[PDB]
């Protein structure tokens, strides 16, 4: 059992294509084949929350649910021969048939990595190549936004990977800020973005009116702050005197966060507007283990499963490849 050794999709075959590309390039010797599975696909729906929900749902102003595809998709490079697990990602894919607000956007729920990639010159270049080349991929098939939220796991935390490296890092937000904001002016410079800004320049730009215009993604900020500011403006009274105030907080938690939340245009003006259906040619993939971050979190705790060292983190990519081949 290895990494290759996995069904292939087109997803999986662009982005590895596009990587050992780079890497080709680069002719550094340390480097090894890298390959990018997708291992978990399956069709999910986001509900509106109970206080937006009688706001804008039972009012017939918004759709009741968002249908979507959940991914999951690991890259492993060859060291010593041997497989090593190295990135991890999580996305959430709504395509031409979701209604507004959400119809035609991708958001990345979830990244991680385990900072054994060889060399460690190339190792940001790498990450930026998988994320550019996915925008690449959702921007052909007629994907017009991303959304990325910029937040770094808390100390000790782990997204994806169970234990990492007591030496491996957590980046403080302004570097990963800065960090997303280079793995996008590459974008642009290729001409796969067209352009980004931060969510309180969008809507400020859309001349956003209403939260029901706001994108609602699973797990999202955003979703759980208008629970709390409609729970908020409902608590109010006022005596005698002699909606567009939930409008207003959004606003101002927008402007207080805009730095960490990303609106990436992948497709622009009227390109934008006469374009076909969203046709996903790969198949759904069943696979309870990948199926959310929490599962593979589990069965790692439950096998002693470490990504601590490049020895533990090359015996756990051997256990998990093993397990995914089996269920
Ligand atoms: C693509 C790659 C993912 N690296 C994850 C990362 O860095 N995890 C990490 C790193 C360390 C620990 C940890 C937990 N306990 N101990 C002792 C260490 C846990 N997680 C991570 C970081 C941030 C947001 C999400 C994911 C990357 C690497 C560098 C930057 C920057 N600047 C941005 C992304
Ligand atoms: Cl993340």
């Given amino acids: 059992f290895s990494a290759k050794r996995l069904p292939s999709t087109r997803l999986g075959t662009f982005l590895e294509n596009r990587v050992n590309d780079f890497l080709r390039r680069q002719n550094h010797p340390e480097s090894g084949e890298v390959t990018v599975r997708v291992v978990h696909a399956s069709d999910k729906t986001v509900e509106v929350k109970p206080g937006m929900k009688a706001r804008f749902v039972d009012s017939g102003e918004m759709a009741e649910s968002f249908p979507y595809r959940t991914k999951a998709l690991f890259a492993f490079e060859e ?11 999580h996305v959430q894919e709504y395509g031409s048939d979701c209604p507004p607000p959400n119809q035609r956007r991708v958001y990345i729920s979830y990244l991680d990595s385990v900072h054994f990639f060889r060399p460690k010159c190339l190792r940001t270049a790498v990450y930026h190549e998988i994320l550019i080349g996915y925008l690449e991929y959702v921007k052909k098939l007629g994907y017009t936004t991303g959304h990325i939220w910029a937040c770094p796991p808390s100390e000790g935390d782990d997204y994806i990977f169970h234990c990492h490296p007591p030496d491996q890092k957590i980046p403080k937000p302004k570097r990963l800020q800065e960090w997303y904001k280079k793995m996008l002016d590459k974008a642009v410079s290729e001409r796969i973005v067209h352009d980004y800004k931060d969510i309180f320049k969008q809507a400020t730009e859309d001349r956003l009116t209403s939260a029901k215009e706001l994108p609602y993604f699973e797990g999202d900020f955003w979703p759980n702050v208008l ?5 908020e403006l409902e608590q109010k009274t006022s005596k005698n005197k002699s909606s567009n105030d939930l409008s207003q907080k959004l606003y101002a938690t927008m402007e207080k966060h805009k730095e960490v939340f990303f609106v990436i245009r992948l497709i622009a003006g009227p390109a934008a507007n006469s374009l076909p259906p969203i046709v996903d040619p790969d198949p759904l ?18 096998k002693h499963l470490e990504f601590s060292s490049l020895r533990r983190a090359q015996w756990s990519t051997g256990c998990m490849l093993v397990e995914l081949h089996t269920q």
């Fill in 79 to 89: 060291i010593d021969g041997v497989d090593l697990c190295f990135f991890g990602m």
């Fill in 285 to 302: 993939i069943p696979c309870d283990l990948m199926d959310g971050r929490d599962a593979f979190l589990t069965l790692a705790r439950d």
């Fill in 227 to 231: 629970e709390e500011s409609i729970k």
